[PDB]
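Hello support,

Our group uses your service weekly, and this is the first time we've seen a run hang past the timeout. The protein is Alpha/beta hydrolase fold-3 domain-containing protein. I'm not sure whether the cause is the sequence or the server load. Input pasted verbatim:
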Amino acid sequence: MPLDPRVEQFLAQMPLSLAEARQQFKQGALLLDQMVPPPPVDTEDGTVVTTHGPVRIRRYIPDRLRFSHPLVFYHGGGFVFGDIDTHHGLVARLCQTVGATVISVDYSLAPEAKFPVPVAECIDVARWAAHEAPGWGLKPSIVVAGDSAGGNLAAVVSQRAKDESLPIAAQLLFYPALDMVHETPSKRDFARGYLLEADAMQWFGEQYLRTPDDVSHPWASPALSPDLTGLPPALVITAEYDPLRDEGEAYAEALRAAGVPTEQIRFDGMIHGFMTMPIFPQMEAAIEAVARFLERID
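Update from on-call engineer: The timeout came from a worker crash unrelated to the input. Re-ran successfully.
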């Protein structure tokens, strides 16, 4: 399908140390928020004790609470970039549009922390949220969510949940990375020029994985897991012109065939990252998709 016009214009107008690259990422997110301000939303900062150390969180409180499970949200950024501030524009909107309390998680970044540290942290935070949920007047079962590398984390947390005694009601995967082993057609064909590029993904892997062999570990590549039965109902949102499209859509198909209630939505003409890019109306459409999906959970 053609590129979305606004996406086409964004790509046309695109033009370090690690510290500098992280600052550049944050600056880009700030600029997008200046162009399309986020809704006001009540928030509370805090810190969760995990098995790998303190992890900062931010709890978002909707104006009007309408959804009976807490969301726990893991930001993207290739395991190396991003934070609660970079993803505030998405999380504020999730909170207010769904009418859900959302816990946004500042998990430890690579290369300082390596695989599988953030996976553990993200499980621990989800367990915390499930324990707190009754005192927020909510059900203990949580909804996990994330974009990109954060979608990887959500997917892995979901696969580990039963074994970790973690009650999870749903998983929301926004253009996740799921299979670091296999090339897919999209990964080959949209490898360069659509914001998320091959060279970057390689580098992200170099930062986050301990050794090359980690690509085949199922906590790094959850798509490799052979048994998907019984996993939490899944919303899998992909972008048409995204190297990660095909592994996302394939995982959705596999979930569906494994009897997992699954909604698979490709946004045509879009690129990786679009749900943190509020210059695109599709970001809000995808947030509406989230609300609609979650209405069906109970």
